[PDB]
């Protein structure tokens, strides 16, 4: 009915956010691992490593927030009512 569509939208948004969270969390983890290792090798490399690191994060979190946007589109402005 209408509530069935609403429930489908809620579950779909949930899945989208879950995928986003897994992706962002593990991606930032695997990037920060390299950052910390580099800073453990050469301390004065820190100011340098913040350029590639934040590039990587800029990509990772990107996929996250895109999903976030679409989750809103699923939950609030649900395409099919």
């Amino acid at each position: 009915m209408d509530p069935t569509i609403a429930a489908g939208a809620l579950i779909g948004g949930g899945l989208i956010m879950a995928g986003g969270a897994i992706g962002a969390g593990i991606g930032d983890g695997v990037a920060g691992n390299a950052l910390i290792s580099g800073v453990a090798r050469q301390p004065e490399a820190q100011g340098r490593l913040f350029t590639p690191f934040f590039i990587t994060v800029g990509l990772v979190e990107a996929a996250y927030f895109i999903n976030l946007a679409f989750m809103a589109l699923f939950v609030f402005a649900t395409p099919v009512k």
Partner: protein
């Protein structure tokens, strides 16, 4: 050889990277060190013989 801990001389200094690791290089470099010392001994004894 006797081992002689010299100093600290290690503050924010950057650590080295060894390939493949530390001990393999150490154990393939020690006989070369003894050979270098024997070579220096031969050279010094030659100069001394000429004096």
């Amino acid at each position: 050889m006797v081992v002689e801990y010299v100093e600290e001389d290690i503050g924010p200094r950057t650590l080295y990277s060894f390939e493949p690791d530390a001990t393999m290089l150490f154990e393939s470099l020690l006989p070369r060190y003894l050979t270098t010392r024997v070579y220096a001994a031969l050279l010094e004894s030659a100069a001394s013989e000429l004096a």
